[PDB]
């Protein structure tokens with residue numbers, strides 16, 4: 001279907017998916033009569049547990065169809081929402097095209113404010129009752145499955161039991177998250193202060209030097225990433241960053257050389273060759289013909305000895321990095337190729353994405369570019385280029401940590417009933433002021449529903465995977481080239497001509513889900529929990545640079561200023 | 577007589593462009609107006 005869009009392909013989807021789901025349900029019902037606390041062999045007990053879930057079928061039929069209808073309605077309203085200019089209501093814009101481009105390119109305060117306010121006011125108002133009832137349905141469903149709430153069901157992903165002291169209680173996750181965020185707060189404070197100081201020049205008379213930042217100036221709809229502010233926060237614009245886009249042009253690099261170069265890099269690292277069958281039954285480059293196919297990169301796990309990658313080639317570095325990312329996914333896929341079907345997966349949700357990130361990062365270093373030959377040896381990069389690159393990386397990495405933590409904390413606290421239904425939005429914004437340090441431009445009462453505007457929230461998805469993986473990557477960094485005796489800066493780490501790092505990686509790759517992720521961490525990193533020290537060590541030079549640059553500044557913020565307090569009027573009424 | 581009509585050009589140039597813009601606006605808004613059901617405000621219907 002991805003290769004060929006036909007109605008026959010769509011009905012083949014429907015039939016195959018229905019058959020697979022029916023087979024899974026019938027197998028679960030047949031195996032449910034096997035008791036659990038009798039098999040001491042863990043590698044089969046894990047399969048029994050992974051096949052034992054009764055899912056939403058415990059819930060009533062009418063309630064089940066109502067829930068499915070509500071989910072479909074939420075997805076449809078998110079996908080087809082539209083707002084537009086009051087001045088000329090005859091032209092209207094969706095969210096994915098234009099509006100995202102507007103918020104990622106526009107420099108007008110009024111335009112950004114209007115778009116940010118209008119999208120929420122015209123989507124969240126519709127979405128509010130649906131979520132208010134969906135949370136109740138999910139809570140009932142979770143309680144029907146011996147869980148405290150749906151948040152407990154989500155947290156059960158990391159839960160490990162009966163492995164003689166390596167167990168991890170579900171409640172322990174919260175403690176780890178808060179302890180990690182405590183050490184992250186000081187660096188985020190400095191970064192936020194520097195960003196506010198830099199934005200003071202772009203939007204004068206709109207930002208208080210000690211207040212929080214207005215929400216509609218973050219470069220994104222919600223602020224999940226701060227990359228779009230790079231042009232407005234460049235430390236040294238006189239010298240450009242590391243760009244080699246003309247290097248492949250000079251050598252006339254077609255859209256085939258990328259994969260061969262990736263294979264050569266893998267061979268130099270120590271990993272074996274690649275399957276010719278994979279080269280044949282794959283989609284290295286988009287045909288470009290009249291047949292539509294999605295250009296979104298994705299690795300496939302067909303099994304049986306064949307894999308493939310779907311991504312539209314192009315002569316640019318990002319394509320090289322994405323190829324490395326997907327190739328890492330594919331390597332991890334063959335890593336558990338000799339495992340049962342129940343074990344043909346990663347240790348948890350944050351394992352597949354952690355491998356591709358480190359793989360791309362190892363090849364993204366300028367040292368690798370110099371070694372390849374594209375970057376001539378005589379050319380050199382000073383400290384300012386490194387600072388610019390580190391700031392660019394930080395604007396993507398650090399920015400999402402407080403946002404992700406705050407979102408997950410809000411969802412967890414709302415799923416356990418600790419927040420009264422009539423006191424959701426207020427509490428939400430309070431966290432935004434005190435965790436993230438962002439203040440809304442206009443007050444929002446309880447009729448709105450702001451987090452429901454995000455795709456992950458309105459589609460029943462867990463957001464914690466973006467947090468822990470972000471840590472694991474950097475932790476993997478300490479396990480990646482420190483064993484490979486790398487002595488230079490951590491941002492210059494590379495593992496070419498290092499077979500020990502490859503062996504250490506393979507030792508955990510060739511495990512699948514057969515062993516707990518804690519066991520893999522102890523096997524490679526040597527710990528039994530996620531650590532934040534590697535991340536702090538990675539950004540030490542930029543941390544020192546910020547500390548030097550923040551002497552004439554006020555690190556931190558006060559959660560009382562607002563862009564509307566200067567023109568507001570207070571009222572006081574005493575009826576009695 | 578059929579060729580003698582001085583036409584609407586006798587008006588001032590700014591007034592002429594204002595009239596032309598307004599007529600075009602009327603035509604466009606009539607051609608592209610749309611209303612739809614509050615029950616499902618995601619699908620909306622034209623006139624023709």
Ligand SMILES: *[C@@H]1O[C@H](CO)[C@@H](O[C@@H]2O[C@H](CO)[C@@H](O)[C@H](O)[C@H]2NC(C)=O)[C@H](O)[C@H]1NC(C)=O
Pocket residue numbers: 041043044
């Ligand atoms: C748990 O049971 C499985 C299922 O038999 C065992 O896995 C097999 O082990 C035998 C030898 O004991 C091998 O010949 C098979 O290749 C293994 N694969 C299968 C069939 O799953 C496993 O050994 C048992 N756990 C123990 C006893 O350590």
Ligand SMILES: *[C@@H]1O[C@H](CO)[C@@H](O[C@@H]2O[C@H](CO)[C@@H](O)[C@H](O)[C@H]2NC(C)=O)[C@H](O)[C@H]1NC(C)=O
Pocket residue numbers: 032054057058
């Ligand atoms: C989910 O699976 C469990 C398996 O135990 C089912 O619970 C059993 O329900 C049957 C009757 O349906 C009883 O005879 C057993 O005593 C129950 N065992 C218990 C309490 O664990 C449960 O009904 C299943 N739900 C559905 C509809 O799939």
Ligand SMILES: *[C@@H]1O[C@H](CO)[C@@H](O[C@@H]2O[C@H](CO)[C@@H](O)[C@H](O)[C@H]2NC(C)=O)[C@H](O)[C@H]1NC(C)=O
Pocket residue numbers: 382383384
């Ligand atoms: C780091 O970047 C700065 C950019 O100027 C340079 O270091 C400073 O350079 C100016 C003029 O040369 C002088 O103040 C000093 O040589 C440096 N300032 C210090 C040490 O405080 C240099 O290009 C790079 N390397 C170092 C060690 O600063």
Ligand SMILES: *[C@@H]1O[C@H](CO)[C@@H](O[C@@H]2O[C@H](CO)[C@@H](O)[C@H](O)[C@H]2NC(C)=O)[C@H](O)[C@H]1NC(C)=O
Pocket residue numbers: 268371496497
């Ligand atoms: C270690 O591995 C690298 C990875 O490429 C190899 O570098 C080769 O040899 C020289 C540089 O040393 C280059 O001109 C070749 O193009 C590289 N090709 C090969 C054979 O991979 C080499 O094996 C070692 N060199 C180092 C230390 O980088």
Ligand SMILES: *[C@@H]1O[C@H](CO)[C@@H](O)[C@H](O)[C@H]1NC(C)=O
Pocket residue numbers: 267272273274
């Ligand atoms: C397989 O790898 C070996 C060792 O790097 C190499 O000599 C050989 O040319 C490779 N063959 C393929 C299929 O690339």
